[PDB]
């Protein structure tokens, strides 16, 4: 009921799905990627409970229903759930006809091709959008940076990687993977809370604990000195009302939860921390790209919302990087939605319809087309 169209900038953020129109200032839809199964499924007069309309409704009315991510580990194992998820999206908070508007889709690196294959044809068929296009959430956040050069620590929704760049020029050889996720810190901190005399196993407990993080957990620049403090650091014992109501006490965990992103020994990953992954990616870089990398040390992720994260960056590099070069880590406050912003700009790139996955091109070339010479 308007002019030509505006794109459908839709993000499948690892934890929450977020989206808006082309060039919107904020993805109007955001909510957990959960599927809900009411445990006991009590029989009452009438009904009123849908199985898995989780969206944002389920967690509030959580407990009976369990939690499910189709994309559990940044990779989706079930889709029926998931396409109904997008239907909820496009008809409950997008409440829009997909056929009406073009949509750009977020796909993470290392995906098997068939994943985007199907996501495509299903969106075509069920959603019959005018047509679609997809892009790497990492890459979309990278355009959200506008910083043509430098690496980005894309530790955002539920994934972590490094994205070395120069003038938009990134090396796939220079990009690695980090299975670490908000889920991982979740499991770790839940473990610690339990072992400290607590029963933290339940799903809603899982959401509560992540929130406990996001509003409480920080990271200390120094590790042992701050742990010695915690031996008697009477500052850090802030106890927080367990949302059920009894204040839950907190100590040094308020920081020593996520640092394991530098030391996965306690979380148990042979992998090396974020910092040295960035650094070795740096070494594999060419000679002088590295000063820019220092200056283009663009962080990304709201999961990385922790205090002193960037400063811990500069100091750790310093310990690693030569003092001769100068280190400048970037980290926008708008990092988790920066991916969606870059998607909105790129899909909004009305000079850039040509890359668009249309009905015909797909149909004549089937699913495989979107993969050859395009994405």
């Amino acid at each position: 009921d308007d002019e030509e169209t505006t794109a459908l900038v839709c993000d499948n953020g690892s934890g929450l799905v977020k989206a808006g129109f082309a060039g919107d200032d904020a993805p109007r839809a955001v909510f957990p990627s959960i599927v809900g199964r009411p445990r006991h499924q009590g029989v009452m007069v009438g009904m009123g409970q849908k199985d898995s309309y989780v969206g944002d409704e389920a967690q509030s009315k959580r407990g009976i229903l369990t939690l499910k991510y189709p994309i559990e580990h940044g990779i989706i194992t079930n889709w029926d759930d998931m396409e109904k998820i997008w239907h909820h999206t496009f008809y409950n908070e997008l409440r829009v006809a997909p056929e009406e508007h073009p949509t750009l889709l977020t796909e993470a690196p290392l995906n098997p091709k068939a994943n985007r294959e199907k996501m495509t044809q299903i969106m075509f068929e069920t959603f019959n959008v005018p047509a679609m296009y997809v892009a790497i959430q990492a890459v979309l956040s990278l355009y959200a940076s506008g910083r043509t050069t430098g690496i980005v620590l894309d530790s955002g929704d539920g994934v972590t990687h490094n994205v070395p760049i120069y003038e938009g020029y990134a090396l796939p050889h220079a990009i690695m993977r980090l299975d670490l996720a908000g889920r991982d810190l979740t499991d770790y901190l839940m473990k610690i809370l339990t072992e400290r005399g607590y029963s933290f196993v339940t799903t809603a407990e899982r959401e509560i604990v992540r929130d406990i993080k996001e509003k409480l957990c920080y990271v200390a620049l120094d590790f042992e000195n701050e742990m010695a403090t915690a031996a008697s650091s009477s500052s850090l014992e802030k106890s927080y009302e367990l949302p059920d109501g009894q204040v839950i006490t907190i100590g040094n965990e308020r920081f020593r939860c996520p640092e394991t992103l530098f030391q996965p020994s306690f979380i148990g990953m042979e992998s090396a921390g974020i910092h040295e992954t960035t650094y070795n990616s740096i070494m594999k870089c060419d000679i002088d790209i590295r000063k820019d990398l220092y200056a283009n040390n663009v962080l990304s992720g709201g999961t990385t919302m922790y205090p002193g994260i960037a400063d811990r960056m500069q100091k750790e590099i310093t310990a690693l990087a030569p003092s001769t070069m100068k280190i400048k880590i970037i980290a926008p406050p708008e990092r988790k939605y920066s991916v969606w912003i870059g998607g909105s700009i790129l899909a909004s790139l009305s000079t850039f319809q040509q890359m668009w996955i249309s009905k015909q091109e797909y149909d004549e070339a089937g699913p495989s087309i979107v993969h050859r010479k395009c994405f």
Binding site: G23, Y143, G146, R147, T148, I345, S350, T351
Partner: protein, 39 residues
């Protein structure tokens, strides 16, 4: 600023570049606002 004028005047290929040199690091911006016009 002239970023409006010169990023509606510069090359496009180099709209990228010169938004990134002539002050619009948010070339991201420059296009989204160019679109706010053509969005």
């Amino acid at each position: 600023e002239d970023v409006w004028e010169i990023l509606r005047q510069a090359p496009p290929s180099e709209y990228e570049r010169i938004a990134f040199q002539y002050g619009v690091t948010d070339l991201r911006g420059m296009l989204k606002r160019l679109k706010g016009m053509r969005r």
